[PDB]
Amino acid sequence: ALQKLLESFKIQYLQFLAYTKTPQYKASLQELLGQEKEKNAQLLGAAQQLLSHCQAQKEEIRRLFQQ
Amino acid sequence: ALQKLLESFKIQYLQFLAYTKTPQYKASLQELLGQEKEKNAQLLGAAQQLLSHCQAQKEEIRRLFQQ
Amino acid sequence: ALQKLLESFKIQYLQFLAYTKTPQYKASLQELLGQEKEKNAQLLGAAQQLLSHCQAQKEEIRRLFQQ
Amino acid sequence: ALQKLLESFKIQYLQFLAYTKTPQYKASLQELLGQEKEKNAQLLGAAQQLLSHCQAQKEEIRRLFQQ
Amino acid sequence: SIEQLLERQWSEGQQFLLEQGTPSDILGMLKSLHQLQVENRRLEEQIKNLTAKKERLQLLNAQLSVP
Amino acid sequence: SIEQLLERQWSEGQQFLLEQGTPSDILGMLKSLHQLQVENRRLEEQIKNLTAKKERLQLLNAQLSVP
Amino acid sequence: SIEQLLERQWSEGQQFLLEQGTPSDILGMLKSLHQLQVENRRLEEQIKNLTAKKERLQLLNAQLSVP
Amino acid sequence: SIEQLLERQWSEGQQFLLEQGTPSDILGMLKSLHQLQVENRRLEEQIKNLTAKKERLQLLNAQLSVP
């Protein structure tokens, strides 16, 4: 029963393994990473504002309580 | 017209002036001051708690914000 | 002793009573009331905004809590 | 290369498949489910209190705002 | 009791200082200047009230709008 | 200006009602009863202040303790 | 796309590891242990939600109760 | 224990799907795409944190600024 299965795994294995290594490798990966690095740059953005703001907030709180 | 008035002021003046100086002086004043000093002692009470509490509050705020 | 006093009260009484009734009556009163009515108009102003705002606040609170 | 791998998968397959079906089946599963159902009963607990409390809170808020 | 009679000066004095004043012009100028004086005071406090009732009510509105 | 003189009654009246009062016993009984009266009033307001300053300061303490 | 197929292992594997498992006892023991697992998770988060919704809702209740 | 082995598929599969992949180009393309993926996730949550920590911290700032 497993013979019909585990061989069909090995069918897909080379079918995609040496196959997309060639022309659909840097078509997907380099496009993926493209929007990924763009997203990362996006995130670095918000996370900045938020920390920088929570620098400003906690600074104004020191002032307003002592005042 | 004022003659009927300003004399009636002077009627009341000695009527209460040398009158209650004698037996209704330390009957009222010493009873008044009695409950007054009692009230003062009362007030000193609340005002204490409130300052002492607003010592504790502002101390725990230093802690909880730094923590 | 009071004779030197209560008569000096009556000195001031007519001294200002029939005196400023004439030329310094509507000089002061009508100037006083002038800035008074101006103040009243001022106050009616703030008290409006405050009630009108505390109409808006308590209306938006109905919304934001039910929402 | 895959031959050394996919066969070793099939080694483990029957090694645990008809093996623990027998004596280590209701030893683990029935003990697992035991503490699971206990946990579920635990969770049903907290989630109750929290909803029941957030029934009480939102009821007292209706009162205190209208009052 | 000295004050009890000290205000008996201010009451009867005011009573007849007004009474002996011109009952044609003053009856309109006084009443207006008394009525407005009180009204401008009452309005002052009611502002002071509504001042805080706004603030504290705005505090809550902030609360709801945050999350 | 009528009040300007109306308080000139209350001032000079009080001035000599006290002055003609017994300068041995009253000098101690009055001063105490004046001094305490003021002090009990000042304390009243300062309580009223600290009353709110507690409340509002306790509001913040709740805030910090919650999350 | 490697993951796309990596999860094709986990899916078909799980599909037949269960399918070849005893369909009499497991059909009851698995389903229960899957159903409860999910349910205990969903309940966990819903607690985490209601945890905060309590806190923040209790914040407001404090607010109203203060003045 | 079925999952214990179900993840043994995903681990060894991934281990050799990568290992048999081109060790020159992928070693750079994968590592980057793994490293950034994690980093973009970690950043997401840390935003979600700082999102609330801002809000709740801004709540307090409002509090202080009011009276």
Curated annotation (Swiss-Prot), chains A, B, C, D:
First and last residue of the signal peptide: none
Disulphide bond pairs: none
Location of the protein in the cell: Nucleus
Family that this chain belongs to: Belongs to the class I-like SAM-binding methyltransferase superfamily. DOT1 family.
Further remarks about this protein from its record: In contrast to other lysine histone methyltransferases, it does not contain a SET domain, suggesting the existence of another mechanism for methylation of lysine residues of histones.
Disorder association: Defects in DOTL1 are associated with an autosomal dominant form of global developmental delay and intellectual disability, with or without one or more major congenital anomalies. The patient phenotypes are characterized by central nervous system (CNS) dysfunction, such as mild motor delay and significant speech and language delay, and a range of congenital anomalies, including brain structural anomalies, cardiac defects, varied urogenital features and growth restriction. Variants may cause a gain-of-function effect leading to an increase in cellular H3K79 methylation levels.
Subunit structure, as described in the record: Interacts with MLLT10.
Record's function text: Histone methyltransferase. Methylates 'Lys-79' of histone H3. Nucleosomes are preferred as substrate compared to free histones. Binds to DNA.
Protein name in UniProt: Histone-lysine N-methyltransferase, H3 lysine-79 specific
Encoding gene, per UniProt annotation: DOT1L
From Swiss-Prot, chains E, F, G, H:
Listed name of the protein: Protein AF-10
Record: disease: A chromosomal aberration involving MLLT10 is associated with acute leukemias. Translocation t(10;11)(p12;q23) with KMT2A/MLL1. The result is a rogue activator protein.
Function: Probably involved in transcriptional regulation. In vitro or as fusion protein with KMT2A/MLL1 has transactivation activity. Binds to cruciform DNA. In cells, binding to unmodified histone H3 regulates DOT1L functions including histone H3 'Lys-79' dimethylation (H3K79me2) and gene activation.
Subunit organization: Self-associates. Interacts with FSTL3 isoform 2; the interaction enhances MLLT10 in vitro transcriptional activity and self-association. Interacts with YEATS4. Interacts with SS18. Interacts with DOT1L; this interaction also occurs with the KMT2A/MLL1 fusion protein. Interacts with histone H3; interaction is necessary for MLLT10 binding to nucleosomes; interaction is inhibited by histone H3 'Lys-27' methylations (H3K27me1, H3K27me2 and H3K27me3) amd acetylation; interaction stabilizes association of MLLT10 at chromatin; interaction is essential for histone H3 'Lys-79' dimethylation (H3K79me2).
Expression sites by tissue: Expressed abundantly in testis.
Disulfide linkage: none
Region (Transactivation domain): 1-67
Location of the region described as Leucine-zipper in the Swiss-Prot/TrEMBL record: 36-64
Subcellular location: Nucleus
Residues of the full protein shown: 715 to 781 of 1068
Coiled coil: none
